[PDB]
Amino acid sequence: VQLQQSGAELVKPGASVKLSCKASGYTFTSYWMHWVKQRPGRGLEWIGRIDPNGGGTKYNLKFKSKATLTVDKPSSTAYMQLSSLTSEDSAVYYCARMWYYGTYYFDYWGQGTTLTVSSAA
Amino acid sequence: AVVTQESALTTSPGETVTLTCRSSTGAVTTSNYANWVQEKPRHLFTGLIGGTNNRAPGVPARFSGSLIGNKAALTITGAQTEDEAIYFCALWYSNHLVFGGGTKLTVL
Ligand SMILES: O=c1occn1/N=C/c1ccc([N+](=O)[O-])o1
Numbered sequence: 663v664q665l666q667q668s669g670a671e672l673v674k675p676g677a678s679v680k681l682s683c684k685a686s687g688y689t690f691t692s693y694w695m696h697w698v699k700q701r702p703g704r705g706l707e708w709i710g711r712i713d714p715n716g717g718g719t720k721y722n723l724k725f726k727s728k729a730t731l732t733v734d735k736p737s738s739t740a741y742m743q744l745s746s747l748t749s750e751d752s753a754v755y756y757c758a759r760m761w762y763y764g765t766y767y768f769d770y771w772g773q774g775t776t777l778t779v780s781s782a783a
Numbered sequence: 784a785v786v787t788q789e790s791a792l793t794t795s796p797g798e799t800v801t802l803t804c805r806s807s808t809g810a811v812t813t814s815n816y817a818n819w820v821q822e823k824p825r826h827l828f829t830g831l832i833g834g835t836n837n838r839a840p841g842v843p844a845r846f847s848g849s850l851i852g853n854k855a856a857l858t859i860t861g862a863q864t865e866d867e868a869i870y871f872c873a874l875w876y877s878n879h880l881v882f883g884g885g886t887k888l889t890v891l
Contacts, residue, residue: 669829669836698873705871705883705884706820706871706884706885707882707883708873708879708880708882711880715800720879721879722879722880723879740847743885755814756828758820758830760830760833761839764814765830765833765834765835765836765837766816766818766875767818767830767833767834767837767839768818768820768833769829769830769839769840769841769842770829770830771820771827771829771830773826774826782813
């Protein structure tokens with residue numbers, strides 16, 4: 663099981679950005695795919711989660727108008743578009759699958775994708 | 784809902800140590816499905832336990848989940864040198880998850 667996310671991104675404030683998470687080595691539709699925000703000194707912070715089978719979602723009230731979780735079943739990938747970017751959105755975003763039939767536990771995480779919302783000088 | 788824990792703990796090699804995960808709203812129940820994750824250096828995350836006490840495949844059996852009083856817990860019976868890492872928990876509110884501050888375990 664491997665969750666290979668996209669490389670480091672550089673994007674201006676106001677613009678949008680699309681991150682990825684190509685899952686492999688297992689049944690993509692069997693597991694969920696959460697998303698987390700790790701900033702320095704803030705620990706972890708929940709964004710949401712998506713069931714690939716049906717594309718149903720459940721967001722945090724803070725990140726309801728920020729993130730956009732979707733999937734592509736053929737490529738077994740999971741995306742997350744962050745819009746209206748600011749200095750607060752500068753964080754390493756991960757993707758962590760979860761078994762949910764009987765019990766809800768994490769297992770395999772991604773390497774992370776460092777996002778830097780930097781203005782053009 | 785703020786998720787309180789201990790800021791940091793310090794166990795010796797071989798000794799037992801008990802982390803915790805308080806909830807601000809009230810006592811932690813089985814409906815919260817208390818999760819646990821270990822962040823080793825170089826940004827290496829690995830989910831240990833979830834749904835209170837149900838372990839994931841590939842996770843060492845020394846890690847165990849329970850409801851001690853009004854909090855969830857991660858008892859590391861027989862701590863290793865490789866266990867030296869941060870430990871975030873995550874309680875469920877009925878519609879989303881909420882992570883805590885984290886607990887930096889330091890094994891001597
Ligand atoms: O849609 C739902 O209804 C009841 C649980 N549920 N989804 C669930 C959960 C539960 C826990 C987590 N979790 O740990 O992130 O997602």
